[PDB]
Amino acid sequence: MQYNIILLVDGSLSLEQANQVNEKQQQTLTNVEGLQTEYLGLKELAYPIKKQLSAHYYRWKFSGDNQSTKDFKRTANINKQVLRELIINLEREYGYLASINPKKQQLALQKRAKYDEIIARENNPENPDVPVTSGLASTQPRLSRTEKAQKPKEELWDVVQKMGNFD
Amino acid sequence: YCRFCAIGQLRIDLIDDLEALKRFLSPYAKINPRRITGNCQMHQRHVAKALKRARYLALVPFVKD
Amino acid sequence: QIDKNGIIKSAQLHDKDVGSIQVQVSLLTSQIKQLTDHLLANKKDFISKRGLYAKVSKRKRLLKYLKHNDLEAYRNLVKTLNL
Amino acid sequence: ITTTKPIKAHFDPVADLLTKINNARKAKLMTVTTIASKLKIAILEILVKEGYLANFQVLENKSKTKRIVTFNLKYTQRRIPSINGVKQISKPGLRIYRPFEKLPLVLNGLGIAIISTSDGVMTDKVARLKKIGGEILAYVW
RNA sequence: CAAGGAUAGCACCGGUGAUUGGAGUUAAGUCGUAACAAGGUACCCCUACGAGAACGUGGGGGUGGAUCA
RNA sequence: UAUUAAUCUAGAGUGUGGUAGGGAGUUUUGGAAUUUCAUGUGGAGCGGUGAAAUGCGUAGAUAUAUGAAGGAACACCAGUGGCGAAGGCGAAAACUUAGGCCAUUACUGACGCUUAGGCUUGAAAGUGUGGGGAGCAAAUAGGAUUAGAUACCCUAGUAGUCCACACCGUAAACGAUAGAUACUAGCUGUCGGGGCGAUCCCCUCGGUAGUGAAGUUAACACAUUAAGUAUCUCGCCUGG
């Protein structure tokens, strides 16, 4: 449960006063501590959020709490010293698993194979090389332990047969 | 044509992967549909929510043409 | 979210009651309390209230069984069927 | 052996058997699995002997933990089943019983009804001859 | 004691009564054709109003409409 | 069997682990801009239709750009997509949390199943209650046109559309296909989950789809998500 918190603060404020604004923001932040004022640079906003064409970007990386970020979000919104107060949680859609997250190493292999650094070709994502026939392949069928085989004979292979003699 | 979960990280925020998002973007406030980039439901969620989020934070034109 | 594992293990007296009537009724009661809290904090969540009534009904039936099978269910009744 | 596709309590053994029988008749299927019971074993044995149904195998996991029966229909070498219609009689919502003197011959005096009585389960003819009646499990013709 | 006889309050049911909605019926009554083609405005469903009226328009629910791959 | 005396899981399910939905609600803003006001310039048109006119413009327009305010709703993503009990869910961002998908001899040992009565919810109009009301249209009103427009045209235009509360609690809430339950040729698609592995291909299961076998509606057709197969329960049904 982690919060990636992105704060866009006023206009073209100098680095020192922007950091002080950010420090006030932790002072009004009730979430988990350990977050440090990381300067992401002064990025040009696509539009003036209120009147600021470009805003100072800052990121904070730490854990998260449940009933401790709504109040921080709305206070950071009301606090005009910071324009924008985006939150990100740990859960967006990705995996919490030791056999679907380590599949991101296969994704790194995909990144490697994205560009043909040699004459040979291993590009074109979704190109079936068919290296896998294994996996689960298991619906877990019920094992059969014999109790009584009442006439174990069973009819099979009903060929298309009729009026075998016509000569 | 699937795009995310092969070039993406399955965890899409704005930073560190904004280029894969902008690939279904133009400074015109539009997102490429499945007819050009046939990404699945979760990848479409990624691109939709994240791109309109970048629009929301004033990173790319929200509606501006 | 679900508030699942902690409540189960608190109601899990031994390794022989992971899915017993006791843990089930405890889960339904804890879910009733949590759903009341949530739906008071979130009014128009009709999903929560319909689920709360469904859990109330299933808890009623679980209690009627638990009194049909074991006669000691109501001698220490901290789960009276009234809600 | 390996008996696949187990079935759990649908609402009763009788309807669980009937749905499988009609599905096998529909899809031209050979062998299907259903629940196991003393009544089911008796009726299945008597239907093997009667000729309407082919053999069956009753299987257990270790105990009452899981008891099922797989059963096959008698088919000529033309994919034609010997079963020309089976109707369940004993039902949960309606417990049906008949005396020994009130049991008819099905089809045209050929079909054999399976009847459990006070002292066992048997066929309609020998149920009438036994002078003992009881519930009916299946009308088979 | 009593069949019974009573008071003021009430209660149940029926018919009637200036005046009157609604129904089937006269191959031969009044307006316009709303609407049945996407039927002269596409249909409507729930609901507000008004309009001789077919109906017409609002806010939502749908295609029980065609076009069209 | 209705009952009793016990057990076993496999129905109710529960556990574990992986585990996704525009789910709901709560809390925020951001913009396309709508309208209005001031800065201005402009120097006789704007506007509306099938046709014009009505209407708007010379206290300076058409229109334009800035600044400021108030309301409304969120371009694309939007899916032979998922979820939500239907009602429904799409500008993004967070939280509470219903519920979900995958596999579990795993645990109580039938705890089950529905549902008349009963509990809760229930698009919406429109009702009043407090705000602003940006815009517009029921009603209303002029010019058309008409055999006549309060119909199709528009302008003016309120209730209302907006939100807070109840009530209205009806809908094309109809898939005109009930809920729980198990099974029935396939085939070609998608999404989610589990395994695996450059991707991938692939397998598993569901969800979400279809042609069509069988089966079933007179027929139209459904068809593995049935209107196929069958059990428990309920609701609806006999001429206009």
mmCIF file with all atom_site columns, C-alpha atoms in Angstrom, chain A residues 4 15 39 51 65 67 72 92 100 106 119 135 145 151-152 161 167:
data_model
loop_
_atom_site.group_PDB
_atom_site.id
_atom_site.type_symbol
_atom_site.label_atom_id
_atom_site.label_alt_id
_atom_site.label_comp_id
_atom_site.label_asym_id
_atom_site.label_entity_id
_atom_site.label_seq_id
_atom_site.pdbx_PDB_ins_code
_atom_site.Cartn_x
_atom_site.Cartn_y
_atom_site.Cartn_z
_atom_site.occupancy
_atom_site.B_iso_or_equiv
_atom_site.pdbx_formal_charge
_atom_site.auth_seq_id
_atom_site.auth_comp_id
_atom_site.auth_asym_id
_atom_site.auth_atom_id
_atom_site.pdbx_PDB_model_num
ATOM 1  C CA . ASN A 1 4   ? 3.213   7.915   -5.486  1.00 0.00 ? 4   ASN A CA 1
ATOM 2  C CA . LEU A 1 15  ? 13.792  26.069  -5.958  1.00 0.00 ? 15  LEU A CA 1
ATOM 3  C CA . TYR A 1 39  ? 12.509  18.066  -7.634  1.00 0.00 ? 39  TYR A CA 1
ATOM 4  C CA . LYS A 1 51  ? -2.848  31.355  -14.364 1.00 0.00 ? 51  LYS A CA 1
ATOM 5  C CA . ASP A 1 65  ? -2.720  4.764   4.396   1.00 0.00 ? 65  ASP A CA 1
ATOM 6  C CA . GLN A 1 67  ? -8.228  7.109   5.812   1.00 0.00 ? 67  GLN A CA 1
ATOM 7  C CA . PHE A 1 72  ? -4.352  15.470  2.469   1.00 0.00 ? 72  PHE A CA 1
ATOM 8  C CA . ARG A 1 92  ? -3.740  0.097   -10.220 1.00 0.00 ? 92  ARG A CA 1
ATOM 9  C CA . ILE A 1 100 ? 3.355   -12.958 -13.018 1.00 0.00 ? 100 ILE A CA 1
ATOM 10 C CA . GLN A 1 106 ? 10.188  -11.792 -20.292 1.00 0.00 ? 106 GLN A CA 1
ATOM 11 C CA . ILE A 1 119 ? 20.465  -9.219  -39.426 1.00 0.00 ? 119 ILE A CA 1
ATOM 12 C CA . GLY A 1 135 ? 1.702   -24.864 -17.988 1.00 0.00 ? 135 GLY A CA 1
ATOM 13 C CA . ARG A 1 145 ? -10.550 -45.859 -7.293  1.00 0.00 ? 145 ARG A CA 1
ATOM 14 C CA . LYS A 1 151 ? -19.923 -56.095 -16.162 1.00 0.00 ? 151 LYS A CA 1
ATOM 15 C CA . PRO A 1 152 ? -16.836 -53.989 -17.025 1.00 0.00 ? 152 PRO A CA 1
ATOM 16 C CA . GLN A 1 161 ? -22.744 -50.754 -40.657 1.00 0.00 ? 161 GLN A CA 1
ATOM 17 C CA . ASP A 1 167 ? -24.232 -60.086 -52.998 1.00 0.00 ? 167 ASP A CA 1
#
